[PDB]
Short mmCIF file of C-alpha atoms and ligand atoms in Angstrom, two decimals:
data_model
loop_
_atom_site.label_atom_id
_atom_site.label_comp_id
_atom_site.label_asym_id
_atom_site.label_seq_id
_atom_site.Cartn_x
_atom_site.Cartn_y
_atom_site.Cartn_z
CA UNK A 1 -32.98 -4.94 -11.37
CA UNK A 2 -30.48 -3.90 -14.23
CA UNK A 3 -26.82 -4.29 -15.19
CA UNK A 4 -25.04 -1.23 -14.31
CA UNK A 5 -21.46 -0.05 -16.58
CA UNK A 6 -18.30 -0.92 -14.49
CA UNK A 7 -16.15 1.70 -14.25
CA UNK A 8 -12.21 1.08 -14.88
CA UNK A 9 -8.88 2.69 -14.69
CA UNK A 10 -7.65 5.45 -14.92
CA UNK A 11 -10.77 7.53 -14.56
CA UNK A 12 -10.42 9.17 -11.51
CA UNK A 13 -14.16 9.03 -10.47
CA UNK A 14 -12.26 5.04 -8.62
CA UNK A 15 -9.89 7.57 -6.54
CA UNK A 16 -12.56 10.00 -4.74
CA UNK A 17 -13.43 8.56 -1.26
CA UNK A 18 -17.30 7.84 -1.13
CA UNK A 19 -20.08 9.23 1.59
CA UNK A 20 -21.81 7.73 4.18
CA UNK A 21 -25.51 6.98 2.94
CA UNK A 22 -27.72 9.44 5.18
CA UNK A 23 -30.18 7.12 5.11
CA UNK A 24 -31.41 3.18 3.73
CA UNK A 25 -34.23 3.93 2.41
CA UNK A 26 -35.83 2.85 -1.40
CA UNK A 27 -33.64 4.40 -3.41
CA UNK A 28 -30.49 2.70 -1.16
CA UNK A 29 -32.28 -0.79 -1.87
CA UNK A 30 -32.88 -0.39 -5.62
CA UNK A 31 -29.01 0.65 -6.09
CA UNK A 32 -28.14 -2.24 -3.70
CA UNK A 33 -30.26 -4.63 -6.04
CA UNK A 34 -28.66 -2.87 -9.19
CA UNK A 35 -25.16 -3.86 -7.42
CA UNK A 36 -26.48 -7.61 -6.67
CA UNK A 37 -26.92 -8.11 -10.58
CA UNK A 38 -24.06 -5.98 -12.16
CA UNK A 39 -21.37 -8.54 -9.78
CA UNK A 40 -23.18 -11.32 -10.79
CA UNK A 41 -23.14 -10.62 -14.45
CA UNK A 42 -19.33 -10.10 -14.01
CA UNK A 43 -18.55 -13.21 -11.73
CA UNK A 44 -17.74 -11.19 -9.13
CA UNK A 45 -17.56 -11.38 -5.24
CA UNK A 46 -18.24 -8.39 -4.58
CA UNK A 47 -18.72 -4.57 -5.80
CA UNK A 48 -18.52 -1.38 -4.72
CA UNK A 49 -21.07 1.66 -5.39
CA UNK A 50 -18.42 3.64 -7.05
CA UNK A 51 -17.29 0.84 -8.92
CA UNK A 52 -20.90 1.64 -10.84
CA UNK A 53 -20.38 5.77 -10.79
CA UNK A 54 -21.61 6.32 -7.00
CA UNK A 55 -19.92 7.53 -4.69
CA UNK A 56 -21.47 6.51 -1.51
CA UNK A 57 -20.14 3.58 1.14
CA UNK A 58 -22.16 1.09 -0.14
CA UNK A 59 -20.84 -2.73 -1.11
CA UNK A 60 -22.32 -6.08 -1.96
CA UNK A 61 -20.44 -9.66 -1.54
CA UNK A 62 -21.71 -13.45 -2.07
CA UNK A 63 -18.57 -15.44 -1.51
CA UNK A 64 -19.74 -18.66 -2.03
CA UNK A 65 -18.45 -22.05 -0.14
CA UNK A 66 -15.81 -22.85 -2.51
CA UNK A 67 -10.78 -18.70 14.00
CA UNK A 68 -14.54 -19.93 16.06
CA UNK A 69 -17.40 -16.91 15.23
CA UNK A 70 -15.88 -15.78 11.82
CA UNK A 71 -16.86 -16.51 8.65
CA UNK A 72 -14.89 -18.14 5.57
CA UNK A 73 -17.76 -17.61 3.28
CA UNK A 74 -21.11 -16.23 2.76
CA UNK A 75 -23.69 -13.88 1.98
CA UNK A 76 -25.58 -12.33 -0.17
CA UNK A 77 -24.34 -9.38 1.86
CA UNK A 78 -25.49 -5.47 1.82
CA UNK A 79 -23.21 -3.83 3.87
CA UNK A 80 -23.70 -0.13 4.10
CA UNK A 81 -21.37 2.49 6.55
CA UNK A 82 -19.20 0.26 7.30
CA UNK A 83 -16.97 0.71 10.30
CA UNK A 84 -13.72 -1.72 10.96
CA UNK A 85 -14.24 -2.62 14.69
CA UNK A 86 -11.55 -5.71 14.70
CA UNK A 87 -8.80 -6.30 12.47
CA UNK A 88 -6.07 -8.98 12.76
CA UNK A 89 -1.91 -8.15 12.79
CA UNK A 90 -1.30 -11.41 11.29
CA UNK A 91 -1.65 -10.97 7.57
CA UNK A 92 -1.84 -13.52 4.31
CA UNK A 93 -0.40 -13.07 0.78
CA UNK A 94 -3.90 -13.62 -1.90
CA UNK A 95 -4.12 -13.31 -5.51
CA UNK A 96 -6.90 -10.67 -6.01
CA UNK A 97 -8.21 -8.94 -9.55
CA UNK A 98 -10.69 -6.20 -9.80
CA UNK A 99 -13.49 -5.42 -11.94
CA UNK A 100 -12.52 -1.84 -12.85
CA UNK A 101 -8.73 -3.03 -13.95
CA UNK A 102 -9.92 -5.63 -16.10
CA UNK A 103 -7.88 -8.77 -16.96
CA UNK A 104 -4.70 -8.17 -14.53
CA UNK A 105 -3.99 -9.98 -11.73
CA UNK A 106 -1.55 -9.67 -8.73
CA UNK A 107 -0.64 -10.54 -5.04
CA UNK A 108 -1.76 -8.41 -2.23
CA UNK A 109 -0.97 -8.93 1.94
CA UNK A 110 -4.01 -7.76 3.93
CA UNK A 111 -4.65 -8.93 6.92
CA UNK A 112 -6.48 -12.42 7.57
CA UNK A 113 -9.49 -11.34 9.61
CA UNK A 114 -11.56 -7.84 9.86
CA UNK A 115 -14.72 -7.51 11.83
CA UNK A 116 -17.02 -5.17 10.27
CA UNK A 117 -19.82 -3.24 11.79
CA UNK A 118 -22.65 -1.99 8.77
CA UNK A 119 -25.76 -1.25 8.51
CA UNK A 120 -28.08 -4.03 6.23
CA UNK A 121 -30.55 -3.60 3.08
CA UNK A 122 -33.24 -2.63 6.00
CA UNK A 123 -31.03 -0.05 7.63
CA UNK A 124 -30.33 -2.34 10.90
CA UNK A 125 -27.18 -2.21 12.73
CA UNK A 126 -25.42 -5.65 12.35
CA UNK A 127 -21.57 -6.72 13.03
CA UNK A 128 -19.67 -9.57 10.35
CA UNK A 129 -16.52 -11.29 11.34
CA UNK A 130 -14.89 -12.62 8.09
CA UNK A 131 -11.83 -14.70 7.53
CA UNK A 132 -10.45 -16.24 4.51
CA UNK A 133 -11.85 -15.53 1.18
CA UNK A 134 -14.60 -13.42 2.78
CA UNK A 135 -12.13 -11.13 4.61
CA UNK A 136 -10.02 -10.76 1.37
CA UNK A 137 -13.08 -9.24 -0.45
CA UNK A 138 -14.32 -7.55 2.29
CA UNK A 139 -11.16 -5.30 2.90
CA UNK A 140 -11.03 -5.10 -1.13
CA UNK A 141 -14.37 -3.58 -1.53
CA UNK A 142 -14.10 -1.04 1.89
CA UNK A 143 -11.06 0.39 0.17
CA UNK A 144 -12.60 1.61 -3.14
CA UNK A 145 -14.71 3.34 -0.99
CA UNK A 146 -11.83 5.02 0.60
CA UNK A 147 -10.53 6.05 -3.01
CA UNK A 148 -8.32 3.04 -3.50
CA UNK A 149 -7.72 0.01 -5.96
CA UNK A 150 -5.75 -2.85 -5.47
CA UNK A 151 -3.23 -1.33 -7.77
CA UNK A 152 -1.80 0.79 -5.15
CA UNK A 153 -0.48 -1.67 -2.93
CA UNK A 154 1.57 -2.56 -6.13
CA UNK A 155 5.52 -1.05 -6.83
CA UNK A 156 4.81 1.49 -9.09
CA UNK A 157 5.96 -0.11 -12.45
CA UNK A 158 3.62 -2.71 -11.97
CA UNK A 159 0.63 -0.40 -11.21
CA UNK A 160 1.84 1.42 -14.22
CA UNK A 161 1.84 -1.76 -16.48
CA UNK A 162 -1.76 -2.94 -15.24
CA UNK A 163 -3.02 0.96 -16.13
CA UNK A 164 -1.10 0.78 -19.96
CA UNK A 165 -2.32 -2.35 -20.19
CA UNK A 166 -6.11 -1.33 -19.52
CA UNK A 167 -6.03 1.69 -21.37
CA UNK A 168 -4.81 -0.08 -24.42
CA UNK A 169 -7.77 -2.42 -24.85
CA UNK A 170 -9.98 0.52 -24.45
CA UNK A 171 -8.37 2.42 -26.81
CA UNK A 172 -11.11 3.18 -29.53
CA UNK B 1 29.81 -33.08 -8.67
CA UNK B 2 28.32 -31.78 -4.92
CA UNK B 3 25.13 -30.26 -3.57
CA UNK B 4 26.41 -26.49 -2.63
CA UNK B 5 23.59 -24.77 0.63
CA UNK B 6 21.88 -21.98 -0.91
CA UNK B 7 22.39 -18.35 0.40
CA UNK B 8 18.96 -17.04 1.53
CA UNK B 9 18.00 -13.62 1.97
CA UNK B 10 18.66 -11.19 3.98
CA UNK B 11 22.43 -12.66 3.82
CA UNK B 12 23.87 -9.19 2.40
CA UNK B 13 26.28 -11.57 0.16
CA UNK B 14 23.30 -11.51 -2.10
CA UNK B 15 23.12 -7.58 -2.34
CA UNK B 16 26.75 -7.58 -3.91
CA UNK B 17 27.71 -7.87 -7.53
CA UNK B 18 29.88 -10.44 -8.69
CA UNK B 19 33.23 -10.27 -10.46
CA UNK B 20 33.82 -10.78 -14.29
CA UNK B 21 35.72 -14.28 -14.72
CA UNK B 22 39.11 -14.09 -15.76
CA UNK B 23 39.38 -17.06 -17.53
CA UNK B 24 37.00 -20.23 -17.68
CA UNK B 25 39.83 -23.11 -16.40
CA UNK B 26 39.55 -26.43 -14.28
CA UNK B 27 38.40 -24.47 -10.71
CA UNK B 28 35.62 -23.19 -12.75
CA UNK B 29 34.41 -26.05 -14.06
CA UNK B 30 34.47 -27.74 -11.17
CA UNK B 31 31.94 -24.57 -9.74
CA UNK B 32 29.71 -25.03 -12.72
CA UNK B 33 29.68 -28.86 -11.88
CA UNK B 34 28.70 -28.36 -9.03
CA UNK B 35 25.87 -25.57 -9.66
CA UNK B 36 24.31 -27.85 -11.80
CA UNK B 37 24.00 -30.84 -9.32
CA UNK B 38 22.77 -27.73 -6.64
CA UNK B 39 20.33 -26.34 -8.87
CA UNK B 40 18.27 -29.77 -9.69
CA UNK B 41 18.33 -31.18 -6.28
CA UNK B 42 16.48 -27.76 -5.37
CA UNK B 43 14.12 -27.98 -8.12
CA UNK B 44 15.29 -25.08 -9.74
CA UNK B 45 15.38 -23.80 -13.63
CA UNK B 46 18.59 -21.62 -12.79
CA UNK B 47 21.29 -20.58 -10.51
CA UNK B 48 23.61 -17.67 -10.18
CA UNK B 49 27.09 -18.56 -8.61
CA UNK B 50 26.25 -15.50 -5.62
CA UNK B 51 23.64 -17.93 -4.40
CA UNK B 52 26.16 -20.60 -3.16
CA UNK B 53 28.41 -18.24 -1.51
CA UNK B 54 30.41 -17.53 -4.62
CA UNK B 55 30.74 -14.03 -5.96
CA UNK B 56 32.01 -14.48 -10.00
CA UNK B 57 29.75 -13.62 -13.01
CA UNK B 58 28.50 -17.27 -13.57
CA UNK B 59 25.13 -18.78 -14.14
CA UNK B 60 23.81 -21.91 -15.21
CA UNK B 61 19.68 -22.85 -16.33
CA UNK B 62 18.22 -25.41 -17.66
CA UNK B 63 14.60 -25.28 -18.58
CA UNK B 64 12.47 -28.10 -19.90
CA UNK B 65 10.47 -28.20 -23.19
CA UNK B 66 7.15 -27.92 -20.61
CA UNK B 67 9.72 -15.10 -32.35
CA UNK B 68 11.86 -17.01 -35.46
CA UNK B 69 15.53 -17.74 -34.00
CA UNK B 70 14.84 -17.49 -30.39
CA UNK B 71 14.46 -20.19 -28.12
CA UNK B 72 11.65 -20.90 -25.51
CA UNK B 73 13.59 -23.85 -23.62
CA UNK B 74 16.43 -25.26 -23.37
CA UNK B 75 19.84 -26.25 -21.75
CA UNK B 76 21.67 -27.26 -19.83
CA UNK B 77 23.30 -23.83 -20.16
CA UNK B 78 26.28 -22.44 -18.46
CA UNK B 79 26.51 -18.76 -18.79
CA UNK B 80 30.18 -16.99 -17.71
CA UNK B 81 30.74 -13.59 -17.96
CA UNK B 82 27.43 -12.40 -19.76
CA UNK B 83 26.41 -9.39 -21.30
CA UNK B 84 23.00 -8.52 -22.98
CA UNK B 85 23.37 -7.63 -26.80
CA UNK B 86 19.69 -6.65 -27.01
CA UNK B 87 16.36 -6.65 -25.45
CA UNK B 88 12.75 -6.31 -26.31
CA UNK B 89 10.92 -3.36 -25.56
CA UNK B 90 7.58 -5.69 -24.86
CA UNK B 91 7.25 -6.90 -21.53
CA UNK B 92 5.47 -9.55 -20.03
CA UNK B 93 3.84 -10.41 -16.08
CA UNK B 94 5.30 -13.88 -15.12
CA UNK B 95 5.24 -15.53 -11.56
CA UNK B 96 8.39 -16.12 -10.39
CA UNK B 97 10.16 -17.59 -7.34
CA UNK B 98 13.34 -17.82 -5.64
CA UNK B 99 15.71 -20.54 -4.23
CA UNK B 100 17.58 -17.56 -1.94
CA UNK B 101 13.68 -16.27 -0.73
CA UNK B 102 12.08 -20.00 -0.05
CA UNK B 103 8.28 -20.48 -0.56
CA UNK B 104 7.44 -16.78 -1.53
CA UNK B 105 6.58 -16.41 -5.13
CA UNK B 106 4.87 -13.18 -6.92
CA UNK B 107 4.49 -11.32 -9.67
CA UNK B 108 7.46 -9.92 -11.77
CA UNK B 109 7.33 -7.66 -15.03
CA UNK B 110 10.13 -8.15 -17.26
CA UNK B 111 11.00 -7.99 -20.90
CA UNK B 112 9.87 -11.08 -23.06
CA UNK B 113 12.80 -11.68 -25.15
CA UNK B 114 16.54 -10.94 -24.70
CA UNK B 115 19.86 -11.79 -26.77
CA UNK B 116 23.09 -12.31 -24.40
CA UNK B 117 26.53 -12.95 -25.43
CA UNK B 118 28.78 -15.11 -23.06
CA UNK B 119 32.00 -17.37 -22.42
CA UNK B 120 30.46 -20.99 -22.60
CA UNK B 121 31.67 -24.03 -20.30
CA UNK B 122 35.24 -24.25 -22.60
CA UNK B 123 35.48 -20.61 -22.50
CA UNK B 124 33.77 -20.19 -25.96
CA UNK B 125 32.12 -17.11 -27.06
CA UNK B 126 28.29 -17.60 -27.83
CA UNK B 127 25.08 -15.99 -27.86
CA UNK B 128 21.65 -17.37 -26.33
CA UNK B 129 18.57 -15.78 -28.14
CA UNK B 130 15.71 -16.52 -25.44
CA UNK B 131 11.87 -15.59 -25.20
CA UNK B 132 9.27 -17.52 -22.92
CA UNK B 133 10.75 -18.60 -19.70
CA UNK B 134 13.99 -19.52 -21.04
CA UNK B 135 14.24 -15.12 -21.00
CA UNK B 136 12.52 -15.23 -17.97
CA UNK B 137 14.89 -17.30 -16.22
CA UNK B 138 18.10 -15.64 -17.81
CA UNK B 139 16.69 -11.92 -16.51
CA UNK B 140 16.45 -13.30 -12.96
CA UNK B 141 19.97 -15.26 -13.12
CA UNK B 142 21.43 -11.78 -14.30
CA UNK B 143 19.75 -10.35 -11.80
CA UNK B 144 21.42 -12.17 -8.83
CA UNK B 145 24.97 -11.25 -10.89
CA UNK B 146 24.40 -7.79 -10.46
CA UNK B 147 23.23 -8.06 -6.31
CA UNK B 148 19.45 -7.58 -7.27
CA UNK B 149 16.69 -10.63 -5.96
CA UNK B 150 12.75 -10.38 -7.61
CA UNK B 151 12.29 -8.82 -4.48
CA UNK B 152 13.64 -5.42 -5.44
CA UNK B 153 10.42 -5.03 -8.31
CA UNK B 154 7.70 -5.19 -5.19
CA UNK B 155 6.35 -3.04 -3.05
CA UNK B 156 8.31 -2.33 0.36
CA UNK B 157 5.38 -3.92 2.18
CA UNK B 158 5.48 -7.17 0.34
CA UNK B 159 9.07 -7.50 0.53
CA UNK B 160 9.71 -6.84 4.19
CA UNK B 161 6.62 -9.30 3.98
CA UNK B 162 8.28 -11.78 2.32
CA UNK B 163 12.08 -11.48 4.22
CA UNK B 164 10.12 -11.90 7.33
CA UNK B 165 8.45 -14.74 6.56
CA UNK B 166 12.03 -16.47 5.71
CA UNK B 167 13.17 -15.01 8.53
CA UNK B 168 10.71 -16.76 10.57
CA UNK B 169 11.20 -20.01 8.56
CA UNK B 170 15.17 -19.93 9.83
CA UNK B 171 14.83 -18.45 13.18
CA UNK B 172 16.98 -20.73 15.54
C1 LIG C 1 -10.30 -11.27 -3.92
C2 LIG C 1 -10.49 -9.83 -3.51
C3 LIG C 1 -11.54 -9.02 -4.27
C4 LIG C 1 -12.69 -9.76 -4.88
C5 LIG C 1 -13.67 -8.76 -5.55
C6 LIG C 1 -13.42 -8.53 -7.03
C7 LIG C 1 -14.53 -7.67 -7.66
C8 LIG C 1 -14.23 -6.22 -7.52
O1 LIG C 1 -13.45 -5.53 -8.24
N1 LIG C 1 -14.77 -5.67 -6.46
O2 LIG C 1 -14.36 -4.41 -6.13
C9 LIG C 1 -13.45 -9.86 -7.69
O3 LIG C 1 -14.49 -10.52 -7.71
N2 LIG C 1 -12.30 -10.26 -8.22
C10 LIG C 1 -12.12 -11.63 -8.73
C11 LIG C 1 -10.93 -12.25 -8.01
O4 LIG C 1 -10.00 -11.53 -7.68
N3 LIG C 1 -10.97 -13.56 -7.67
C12 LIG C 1 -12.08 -14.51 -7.92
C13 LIG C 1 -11.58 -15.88 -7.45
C14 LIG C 1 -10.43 -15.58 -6.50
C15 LIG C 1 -9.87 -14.22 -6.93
C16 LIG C 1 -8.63 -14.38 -7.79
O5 LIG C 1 -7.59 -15.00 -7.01
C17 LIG C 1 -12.04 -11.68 -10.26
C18 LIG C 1 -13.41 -11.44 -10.88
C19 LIG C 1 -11.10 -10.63 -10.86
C1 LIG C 2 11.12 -17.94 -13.27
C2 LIG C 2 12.32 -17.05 -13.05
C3 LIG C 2 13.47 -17.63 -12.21
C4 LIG C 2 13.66 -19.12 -12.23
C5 LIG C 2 14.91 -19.50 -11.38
C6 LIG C 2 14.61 -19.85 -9.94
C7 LIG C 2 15.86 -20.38 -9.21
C8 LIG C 2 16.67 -19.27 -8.64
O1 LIG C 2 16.45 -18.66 -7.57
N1 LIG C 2 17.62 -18.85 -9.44
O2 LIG C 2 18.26 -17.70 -9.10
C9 LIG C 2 13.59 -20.93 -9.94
O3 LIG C 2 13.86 -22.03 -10.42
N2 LIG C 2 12.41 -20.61 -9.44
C10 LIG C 2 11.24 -21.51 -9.56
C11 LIG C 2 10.12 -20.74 -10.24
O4 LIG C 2 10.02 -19.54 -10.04
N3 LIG C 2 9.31 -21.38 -11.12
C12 LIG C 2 9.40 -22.80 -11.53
C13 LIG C 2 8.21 -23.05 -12.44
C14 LIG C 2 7.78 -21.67 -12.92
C15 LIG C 2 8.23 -20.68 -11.85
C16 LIG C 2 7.09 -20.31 -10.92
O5 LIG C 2 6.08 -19.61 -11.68
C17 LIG C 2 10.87 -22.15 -8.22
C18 LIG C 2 11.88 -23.23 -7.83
C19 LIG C 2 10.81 -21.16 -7.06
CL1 LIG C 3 -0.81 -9.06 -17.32
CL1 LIG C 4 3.41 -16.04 1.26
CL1 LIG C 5 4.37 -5.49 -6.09
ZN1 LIG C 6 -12.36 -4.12 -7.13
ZN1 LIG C 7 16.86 -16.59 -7.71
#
């Protein structure tokens, strides 16, 4: 299991919506395992696949310990196809960052419970029903597979400013 | 010296600009006197005159001790009639807050360092040379002069977010 090259903004590979995985089969769980390692080595709670240059709907969370039948915390999780089957109105203001805009941080409202259903590293059918933290980077990690970073729920300056300021410490 | 209620938003009277001062004389002392006592009985490190019901170019800050001729703290300040003689091109992300939007605090972009020339408590001509959060603070106070709250530099979504939740706060 290796430690795969985050990619970061602006490259546009982080705004193409990713593909539902056919099928979980070996080459599924080595990517998933790949995943596991690359957030770890960044202190990360979770990752998307196209956060590592694939573009299939594929994301890993561990959210460690720090509404009855949800979750605050958890995992390792392999959640694969997901599918939003619950989602709360009321919504909460977090602090989030993101491994692909590297070093800026900013306040996003999402809403404070999702249920989720996915398939697992084996390929079986299971639901989650996060909360808290676990929500948060749940609903993070579905949307870069739908194309989008946190960055767009910013005004436009700001998103502008987070971009400049990436793109100047990888200027070479 | 008395404690003046602070306007909260959406109270349009903070979407107007205020008035240049005609001249600094007892009556707005007396205001200034009374900003002052307003402003540290609400915690704050500034206070625009709009945000006790009082629509003239006025301001005061103080800000605690926790570029060469600029200053990174300081006070206690009061600021009539000011106009900014030059700003930096560099800007910085700071969290900021508001006494007019109560408990909601994000993210603001804003130039580090600014030069402002104003009429002083005896009607004096000066200039304040600020950086840190002594700039910070001046930017918002200006702000309020002109109509504007830190509300303006977020996304719709997290505004509306954040008037609501006031909103809810004062609901009768
Ligand atoms: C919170 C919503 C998203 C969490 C997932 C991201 C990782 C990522 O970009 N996944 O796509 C993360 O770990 N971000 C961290 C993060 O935002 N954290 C970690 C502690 C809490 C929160 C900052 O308030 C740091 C590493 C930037
Ligand atoms: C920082 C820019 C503006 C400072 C002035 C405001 C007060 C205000 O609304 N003036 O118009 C303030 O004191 N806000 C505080 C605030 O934002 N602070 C105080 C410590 C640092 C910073 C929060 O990061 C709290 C009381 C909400
Ligand atoms: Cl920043
Ligand atoms: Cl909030
Ligand atoms: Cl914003
Ligand atoms: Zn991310
Ligand atoms: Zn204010």
């Amino acid at each position: 299991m290796s430690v795969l090259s985050i990619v970061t903004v602006p490259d546009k590979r982080l705004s193409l919506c990713s593909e539902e995985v056919e099928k979980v089969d070996q080459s599924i769980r080595k990517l998933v395992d790949d995943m596991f390692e690359t957030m770890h080595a960044n202190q990360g709670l979770g990752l998307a696949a196209v956060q590592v240059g694939v573009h299939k709907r594929i994301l890993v969370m561990n959210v460690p310990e720090e509404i009855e039948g949800y979750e605050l915390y958890g995992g390792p999780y392999c959640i694969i196809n997901p599918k939003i089957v619950d989602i709360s109105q009321e919504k909460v203001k977090l602090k989030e960052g993101c491994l692909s805009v590297p070093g800026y941080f900013d306040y996003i409202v999402r809403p404070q419970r999702i249920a989720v259903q996915y398939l697992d590293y084996n390929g079986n059918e299971c639901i989650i029903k996060a909360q808290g933290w676990l929500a948060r980077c749940l609903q993070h990690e579905i949307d870069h597979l739908n194309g989008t970073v946190f960055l767009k729920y910013l005004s436009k300056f700001k998103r502008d400013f987070a971009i400049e300021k990436v793109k100047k410490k990888e200027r070479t």
